[PDB]
Amino acid sequence: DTKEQRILRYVQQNAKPGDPQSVLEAIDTYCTQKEWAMNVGDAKGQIMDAVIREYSPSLVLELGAYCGYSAVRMARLLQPGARLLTMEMNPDYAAITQQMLNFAGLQDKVTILNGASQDLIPQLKKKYDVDTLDMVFLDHWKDRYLPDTLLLEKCGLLRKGTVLLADNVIVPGTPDFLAYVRGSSSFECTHYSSYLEYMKVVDGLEKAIYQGP
Ligand SMILES: O=C(NCCCCCn1ccnc1)c1cc(-c2ccc(F)cc2)cc(O)c1O
Ligand SMILES: [K+]
Ligand SMILES: [Mg+2]
């Protein structure tokens, strides 16, 4: 019995099917009262919501799904017809995320891609019929934020205005990614100071808007 299975069971028994807000509230209650887990959380989640509402992206890519908390958070605010693709290397987490989206009634808006982001990103154009991405949410291996951002550019997946939103830039931290985007004329950066999910520890989101080559 895993922590991720316990979170999914808790949602199924304490939230309303087809109600994404109740799913988010149940995950946040479980993680504050029972066991911490690496979901983006409500503090950083409110900043995510404000970014999503500002840009109303039609196609979002997420790197790292975990239990589907951030996928539910983003997908619930997407416009009819807009889509989210989420890459998850851990098959057990991918199965939890699929069941979380199904319970939230968001399954038609989100596609889980099982595998490594370094292998899946080069297949987006030809296999998944992607042209360019409107937004990317980075929440996977912290040492992969920079290489995958460089890979997205190489693959022609970024366009002028693509919004990169990165979790955990302070804790655990993404020092090479932060230094790179903040020092590059190809990105316009904004830091949103906040708190590590379910903890009185400072963390933050970085928004890095791609400006073209
Ligand atoms: O490691 C994290 N995420 C990546 C999980 C593996 C992704 C693998 N993958 C998925 C797809 N392709 C590759 C993470 C960790 C923490 C944290 C903070 C404080 C602490 F004391 C311990 C941990 C907080 C988060 O918010 C995080 O996201
Ligand atoms: K999450
Ligand atoms: Mg995170």
From Swiss-Prot:
<dbReference type="GO" id="GO:0045211">
    <property type="term" value="C:postsynaptic membrane"/>
</dbReference>
<dbReference type="GO" id="GO:0032502">
    <property type="term" value="P:developmental process"/>
</dbReference>
<dbReference type="GO" id="GO:0046500">
    <property type="term" value="P:S-adenosylmethionine metabolic process"/>
</dbReference>
<dbReference type="GO" id="GO:0048662">
    <property type="term" value="P:negative regulation of smooth muscle cell proliferation"/>
</dbReference>
<dbReference type="GO" id="GO:0007612">
    <property type="term" value="P:learning"/>
</dbReference>
<dbReference type="GO" id="GO:0098978">
    <property type="term" value="C:glutamatergic synapse"/>
</dbReference>
<dbReference type="GO" id="GO:0007611">
    <property type="term" value="P:learning or memory"/>
</dbReference>
<dbReference type="GO" id="GO:0009266">
    <property type="term" value="P:response to temperature stimulus"/>
</dbReference>
<comment type="function">
    <text>Catalyzes the O-methylation, and thereby the inactivation, of catecholamine neurotransmitters and catechol hormones. Also shortens the biological half-lives of certain neuroactive drugs, like L-DOPA, alpha-methyl DOPA and isoproterenol.</text>
</comment>
<dbReference type="GO" id="GO:0006950">
    <property type="term" value="P:response to stress"/>
</dbReference>
<dbReference type="GO" id="GO:0030424">
    <property type="term" value="C:axon"/>
</dbReference>
<dbReference type="GO" id="GO:0032259">
    <property type="term" value="P:methylation"/>
</dbReference>
<dbReference type="GO" id="GO:0009611">
    <property type="term" value="P:response to wounding"/>
</dbReference>
<dbReference type="GO" id="GO:0031982">
    <property type="term" value="C:vesicle"/>
</dbReference>
<dbReference type="GO" id="GO:0097336">
    <property type="term" value="P:response to risperidone"/>
</dbReference>
<feature type="binding site">
    <location>
        <position position="142"/>
    </location>
    <ligand>
        <name>substrate</name>
    </ligand>
</feature>
<keyword id="KW-0949">S-adenosyl-L-methionine</keyword>
<dbReference type="GO" id="GO:0001963">
    <property type="term" value="P:synaptic transmission, dopaminergic"/>
</dbReference>
<dbReference type="GO" id="GO:0032496">
    <property type="term" value="P:response to lipopolysaccharide"/>
</dbReference>
<dbReference type="GO" id="GO:0044297">
    <property type="term" value="C:cell body"/>
</dbReference>
<keyword id="KW-0472">Membrane</keyword>
<keyword id="KW-0128">Catecholamine metabolism</keyword>
<dbReference type="GO" id="GO:0050965">
    <property type="term" value="P:detection of temperature stimulus involved in sensory perception of pain"/>
</dbReference>
<dbReference type="GO" id="GO:0097018">
    <property type="term" value="P:renal albumin absorption"/>
</dbReference>
<dbReference type="GO" id="GO:0097333">
    <property type="term" value="P:response to olanzapine"/>
</dbReference>
<dbReference type="GO" id="GO:0006584">
    <property type="term" value="P:catecholamine metabolic process"/>
</dbReference>
<dbReference type="GO" id="GO:0021696">
    <property type="term" value="P:cerebellar cortex morphogenesis"/>
</dbReference>
<keyword id="KW-0597">Phosphoprotein</keyword>
<feature type="binding site">
    <location>
        <position position="89"/>
    </location>
    <ligand>
        <name>S-adenosyl-L-methionine</name>
    </ligand>
</feature>
<dbReference type="GO" id="GO:0014046">
    <property type="term" value="P:dopamine secretion"/>
</dbReference>
<feature type="binding site">
    <location>
        <position position="167"/>
    </location>
    <ligand>
        <name>Mg(2+)</name>
    </ligand>
</feature>
<dbReference type="GO" id="GO:0008542">
    <property type="term" value="P:visual learning"/>
</dbReference>
<dbReference type="GO" id="GO:0033555">
    <property type="term" value="P:multicellular organismal response to stress"/>
</dbReference>
<keyword id="KW-0812">Transmembrane</keyword>
<keyword id="KW-1133">Transmembrane helix</keyword>
<feature type="binding site">
    <location>
        <position position="168"/>
    </location>
    <ligand>
        <name>Mg(2+)</name>
    </ligand>
</feature>
<dbReference type="GO" id="GO:0035812">
    <property type="term" value="P:renal sodium excretion"/>
</dbReference>
<keyword id="KW-0963">Cytoplasm</keyword>
<keyword id="KW-0443">Lipid metabolism</keyword>
<dbReference type="GO" id="GO:0033344">
    <property type="term" value="P:cholesterol efflux"/>
</dbReference>
<dbReference type="GO" id="GO:0050890">
    <property type="term" value="P:cognition"/>
</dbReference>
<dbReference type="GO" id="GO:1990776">
    <property type="term" value="P:response to angiotensin"/>
</dbReference>
